[PDB]
Amino acid sequence: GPLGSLVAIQAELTKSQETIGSLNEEIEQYKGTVSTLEIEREFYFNKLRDIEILVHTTQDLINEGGGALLRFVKKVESILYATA
Amino acid sequence: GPLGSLVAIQAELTKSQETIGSLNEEIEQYKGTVSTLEIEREFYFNKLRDIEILVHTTQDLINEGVYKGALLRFVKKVESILYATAEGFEM
């Protein structure tokens, strides 16, 4: 009857509001994991950038103003731009 | 009466089943963003590892005199950059 249908929907509704609660919990932990990975990424990208700047600057400095130095600089450059 | 309240709670229920649907899409999006960041990481870690090997190997040839200056200066600059990257693996 009316009461039975009201009770069944109310039960499924509170069960649904539970899932929403647990899915929001997951989203907050995923937001936290993306944030950590993005903080790490900015740090490592800066170190690789410092190596890239050094490689290109030395390549320019060798040009007008390298023997074994140029050979090493080119070996580093090939490591940076390799695709795997 | 009872029909009105049944209609209002059924509407709340189907609306909440739609939010679970959209929250599951967000989770799949977030799983995809964590996966991309972890794939980048493995690739850039591999390059750092290869630069470390190269830096130490050529330092061994400069130390154990196998060249008969500016090269050692450059090798040491790279090594300091690599050490600073190792130092920030906790921070």
Side-chain angles (χ1 to χ4, degrees), chain A residues 1-14 16-84, chain B residues 1-41 43-67 69-89:
Chain A
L3 198 53
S5 297
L6 280 165
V7 167
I9 293 168
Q10 180 65 259
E12 199 43 68
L13 176 69
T14 78
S16 266
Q17 287 163 332
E18 258 199 303
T19 306
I20 284 152
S22 85
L23 290 179
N24 279 345
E25 245 144 39
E26 276 199 41
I27 281 143
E28 286 299 289
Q29 70 192 91
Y30 276 115
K31 278 176 176 178
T33 160
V34 164
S35 187
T36 177
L37 288 162
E38 285 173 346
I39 289 158
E40 284 181 27
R41 188 210 191 261
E42 190 228 286
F43 176 79
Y44 295 114
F45 269 38
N46 274 324
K47 296 305 191 232
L48 287 154
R49 183 57 166 161
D50 291 342
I51 295 168
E52 191 176 35
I53 287 161
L54 176 69
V55 160
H56 299 304
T57 287
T58 311
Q59 249 162 29
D60 296 356
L61 147 93
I62 277 156
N63 290 328
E64 203 89 308
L69 176 60
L70 185 71
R71 215 172 296 145
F72 185 82
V73 170
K74 285 291 180 182
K75 275 178 246 175
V76 184
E77 207 207 328
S78 75
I79 297 167
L80 299 175
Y81 313 122
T83 59
Chain B
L3 198 277
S5 70
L6 177 72
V7 166
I9 103 288
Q10 177 64 258
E12 288 158 54
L13 175 62
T14 80
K15 207 199 178 189
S16 78
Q17 286 163 332
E18 283 183 354
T19 103
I20 115 114
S22 86
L23 291 175
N24 279 345
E25 302 295 67
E26 275 198 42
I27 281 142
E28 287 298 289
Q29 242 92 99
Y30 278 114
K31 280 176 176 178
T33 157
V34 165
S35 187
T36 290
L37 288 161
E38 285 172 347
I39 290 159
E40 282 182 341
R41 219 251 302 277
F43 179 68
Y44 69 69
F45 274 179
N46 272 325
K47 294 195 174 306
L48 287 158
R49 172 211 69 195
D50 293 344
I51 293 168
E52 202 186 65
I53 288 154
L54 174 68
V55 159
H56 297 305
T57 289
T58 107
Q59 244 164 29
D60 293 356
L61 313 182
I62 304 156
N63 284 349
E64 312 144 354
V66 170
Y67 282 93
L71 172 62
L72 186 69
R73 214 172 295 146
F74 184 83
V75 171
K76 284 292 178 180
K77 275 179 245 176
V78 186
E79 205 207 307
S80 73
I81 300 167
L82 301 163
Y83 186 80
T85 140
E87 209 136 67
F89 214 108

